Amino acid sequence: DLLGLLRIRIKRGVNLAVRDISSSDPYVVVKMGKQKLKTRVINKDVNPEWNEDLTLSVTDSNLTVLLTVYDHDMFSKDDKMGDAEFEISPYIEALRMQLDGLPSGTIVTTVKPSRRNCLAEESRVTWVDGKLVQDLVLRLRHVECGEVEAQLQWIDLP
């Protein structure tokens, strides 16, 4: 049933919540359907630069991705550091586009911050270097501070 694979590049966290004394040990957990993926832990850093790829199998245009940040405590429970979700459908519908041969830098669809989504700023779906890309800044919900910067890429699966 597979449509393809979505690469979620988790770039970094910005000003993440402090869940130890003075810092945190954040890792990101991403869920979609029954799939559950996580980045590595970055030690003692509220602006962790993960630059890390998570790969999800996609069977559905109508699916939502959930992202949760936790602070790893080796010898105890891990505290919540906020969560956000986002839609992939706009990305997916832009893939089915007749896109090929547009100038690099070309902005194709734009998703706007709403009371209902987690975007800290409008999300540009861009056609660069022969690939369709979506960049996101997600404002974490349920926490006193924190943002996560991610980028979507698509992998065809023959």
Per-residue mark of binding to Ca ion, 75-114 (x: CB under 5 A):
----x-----------------------------------
Closest to 108 (Cα-Cα) out of 59, 158, 152: 152
Q: Regarding beta strands 4-14 and 26-32, do their DSSP bridges make them parallel or antiparallel, or are they unpaired?
A: unpaired
Cα–Cα dist 91/63, whole Å: 11
User: CB under 8 Å to 127, separation ≥6 — which residues?
Assistant: 99, 102, 103, 104, 105, 106, 107, 108, 133
Binding flag, residue 52, Ca ion (CB under 5 A): no
Residue 71 contacts Ca ion per CB under 5 A: yes
Is 20 a residue that touches Ca ion (CB under 5 A)? yes
Query: Count of residues binding Ca ion (CB under 5 A)?
Result: 6
Binding to Ca ion by CB under 5 A, coded x per residue (else -) over 127-156, reads ------------------------------
Question: Is residue 121 part of the contact set for Ca ion (CB under 5 A)?
Answer: no
Selected from 8, 10, 16, 25, the binder of Ca ion by CB under 5 A is 25
State the residues that interact with Ca ion by CB under 5 A: 19-20, 25, 71, 73, 79
